[PDB]
Amino acid sequence: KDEEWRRAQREWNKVWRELEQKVFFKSLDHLGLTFKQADKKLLTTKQLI
DNA sequence: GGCGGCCGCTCTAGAACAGGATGTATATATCTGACACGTGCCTGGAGACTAGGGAGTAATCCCCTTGGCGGTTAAAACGCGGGGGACAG
């Protein structure tokens, strides 16, 4: 059971890491995730007025 | 002495229960008639082979649906009045 759980963890490890490589940095971005819409919303004429 | 109130008595009726009735549930007896087993083929699938052609895969590309924004006014939702219909009878 230990050996099979170990190799199960081993081949799950690669997909786990490749998913976390693109997930973690985007997760750390909080304001920048909504920046693509907030910049369009707030850099307008009436907002600056 | 008269009358309202209370309790007992008999009348009546709803309902649970038992018995009769008639059309089906079964216990054999026996028929019987297709069921499946055996046989004899024999005719269509399978091994093997030849050839070729349509899709799997790779690449591209441009295109089209998803996410994502607001504006706005049409509309969903809430609530009040009420009114005509579903349903019990």
UniProtKB/Swiss-Prot annotation:
- Note the superkingdom of the native organism: Eukaryota
The record's subcellular locations are:
Nucleus
Purpose: Catalytic component of the RPD3 histone deacetylase complexes RPD3C(L) and RPD3C(S) responsible for the deacetylation of lysine residues on the N-terminal part of the core histones (H2A, H2B, H3 and H4). Histone deacetylation gives a tag for epigenetic repression and plays an important role in transcriptional regulation, cell cycle progression and developmental events. SIN3 also has a RPD3 independent function required for normal longevity.
Subunit organization:
Component of the RPD3C(L) complex composed of at least ASH1, CTI6, DEP1, PHO23, RPD3, RXT2, RXT3, SAP30, SDS3, SIN3, UME1 and UME6. Component of the RPD3C(S) complex composed of at least EAF3, RCO1, RPD3, SIN3, and UME1. Interacts with ESS1 and STB1.
Any extra remark in the record? Present with 1660 molecules/cell in log phase SD medium.
Q: What is this protein called?
A: Transcriptional regulatory protein SIN3
Query: What organism does the record attribute this protein to?
Result: Saccharomyces cerevisiae (strain ATCC 204508 / S288c) (Baker's yeast)
Gene encoding this polypeptide? SIN3
